[PDB]
Structure formats: structure tokens, C-alpha cells
């Protein structure tokens, strides 16, 4: 959203569930945003650096999330198995 001359004219841009590209509308509570993590090449938790992702309320209600992430950090680049795009 913007003017004639490149002036972002808004309150903000809404944040949008990360697997579901709906919206997160202010006063959700249900509302999470994850901060997993990465290892460094060693049993050491990497600090000040992490992943992210972002759950609606939407799906907390429906069982969903557990299987929605178990798509995504396997789908990203950390996890191996559990999950299948071919059930």
C-alpha cells in the first residue's frame, strides 16, 4: 500500500502464517512465533542466530500444527524423515 510518490502510507504490514499465507490480525494471544535451533559443527546450541517460521490462531485449533511443521525443519534443511508428501 502506497501513495503517488513512494510514501508507504499505512500503520504496518501484517505478519501471515508460515504452511497457511493467511493473516495475523492484531489480538490473537492464540499466537506463536518460533525461535527452534541451528548445530554449529560440534552438542552446542548456536546463540543469537535461529529459526524463523509463525503460527496463526487458526490451526492450534485443529491438531494441524504438529503435522504442519513436521512439513517444514525437514522441509527447510535440518531434519530427516518422520515426514511424507505421499501419504
Amino acid at each position: 500500500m502506497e501513495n503517488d510518490k513512494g510514501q508507504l502510507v499505512e500503520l504496518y504490514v501484517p505478519r501471515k502464517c508460515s504452511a497457511t499465507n493467511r493473516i495475523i490480525k492484531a489480538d490473537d494471544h492464540a499466537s506463536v512465533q518460533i525461535n527452534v535451533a541451528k548445530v554449529d559443527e560440534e552438542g552446542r546450541a548456536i546463540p543469537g542466530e535461529y529459526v524463523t517460521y509463525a503460527l496463526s490462531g487458526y490451526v492450534r485449533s485443529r491438531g494441524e500444527s504438529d503435522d504442519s511443521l513436521n512439513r517444514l525443519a525437514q522441509n527447510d534443511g535440518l531434519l530427516k524423515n518422520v515426514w511424507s508428501y505421499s501419504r
Binding site: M1, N3, K25, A26, N35
Partner: protein, 216 residues
């Protein structure tokens, strides 16, 4: 004194947080109220309806005096609450707060002709409570604030300036009416138009960014 409570309170006293748009981004809660006192001062109150009830005792009829209160400024910020109480002087009062935790953005914007300086909504919205249905619709320039005395009121405080309206919808219910209308503007933001799709990429939560101040 203020004083504080929770991780969220402490922060804003100190002033590690600045604007209300932090708080709707990460979409926090809010329990304390001063949390938007320090921030938005612009804020002004307004009393819509002071009605008696009643819960009817063994040789009498008890009464309170629902008030219902609306708050905000001009810029995309409405507040709304409904605290019965007994005597007016809790009843308004700790209405005024009831509304303040319920501050809610809006997402003034364009009719068409982009031009320069928002006057109307972005899009069509609807709301529903029990009976009332509100169909807010974006109107071109100073067309006007097309509605009942009260709706006008809400919608002024929330500038916004111009927009067609319509009801259904028993709107001798001043209370179920506002309930509703409110739940629509609070829902401009809860509607994907092309101009959002450009994926924004998550900041980092206050709840562990100033983790230490946030506690003893």
C-alpha cells in the same frame, strides 16, 4: 504513582518499545492498561449510552447503570468496552479502561485514484452480533459519514472522514450495534489484497530481545 506488572509492562515504562505498530506486528496481549496511556496520549474518550439494566431482592429490585465507552484519536486507532457497575462517577471509569485494553487498528486508505492522503477504507467490510449486520463501503472523497448519529461518532474518532454504510438488525440496540460495526473495521486487517503478497520476513519478538531488563 504508575508501577508495573508482567514482562510486557516493566518494558514500556523504561521505553525499550516506542509505537503501538511493534505491538500489533508480534500481536501481543494486554491484562495492564497504562501500556497505551505511556505510548498513545492523543487518545480521547466519549460516552455513548448510560442505561439502567436489571437483575431484579426478596423485597426489592436491584439496579446498575452498562456504560459503554469508545476511545481513540484520529489515526487508525479505535477502543471499545462495556463495564456494568454500581452507581456510575467503578462504572463509567474502569469502562474507559475496559476500552483502552481493546485498542485496535485500522486500514484508512484509497477509494481509487490513489492521490495523496488517506480518507476512506481499503475495502469492503462486514460485521456481525446476534442481530445487527453492518455493511461498512469505501466512498470517494468527503462524500460523508453516512450512518446513525452513533456509528457516525465511532467512525470519526477512528478519522477514517468518509464511507457509505448500511443495517438490517434491531438498531434499537445501542450496544449490539457498535458491538458489531467494530468487528469489521477491526478486519480491514483480515484481507489479502495483492499489495500485501510481497512476503515480509518476520522480525524478532520483544519477549526475548530485551530479556534482562524484562524480571528482578
Amino acid at each position: 504513582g504508575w508501577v508495573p506488572v508482567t514482562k510486557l509492562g516493566r518494558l514500556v515504562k523504561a521505553g525499550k518499545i516506542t509505537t503501538i505498530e511493534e505491538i500489533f506486528l508480534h500481536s501481543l496481549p494486554v491484562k495492564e492498561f497504562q501500556i497505551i496511556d505511556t505510548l498513545l496520549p492523543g487518545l480521547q474518550d466519549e460516552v455513548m449510552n448510560i442505561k439502567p439494566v436489571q437483575k431484579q431482592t426478596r423485597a426489592g429490585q436491584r439496579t446498575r447503570f452498562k456504560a459503554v465507552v469508545v476511545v481513540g484519536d484520529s489515526n487508525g486507532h479505535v477502543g471499545l468496552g462495556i463495564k456494568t457497575a454500581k452507581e456510575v462517577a467503578g462504572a463509567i471509569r474502569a469502562g474507559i479502561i475496559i476500552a483502552k485494553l481493546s485498542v485496535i487498528p485500522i486500514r484508512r486508505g484509497y477509494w481509487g485514484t490513489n492521490l495523496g492522503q488517506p480518507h476512506s477504507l481499503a475495502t469492503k467490510t462486514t460485521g456481525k452480533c446476534g442481530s445487527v449486520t453492518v455493511r461498512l463501503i469505501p466512498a470517494p472523497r468527503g462524500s460523508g459519514i453516512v450512518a446513525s448519529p452513533a456509528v457516525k461518532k465511532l467512525l470519526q474518532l477512528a478519522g477514517v472522514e468518509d464511507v457509505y454504510t448500511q443495517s438490517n438488525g434491531k438498531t434499537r440496540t445501542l450496544e449490539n450495534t457498535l458491538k458489531a460495526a467494530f468487528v469489521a473495521i477491526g478486519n480491514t486487517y483480515g484481507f489479502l489484497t495483492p499489495n500485501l503478497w510481497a512476503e515480509q520476513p518476520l522480525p524478532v519478538s520483544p519477549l526475548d530481545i530485551y530479556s534482562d531488563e524484562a524480571s528482578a
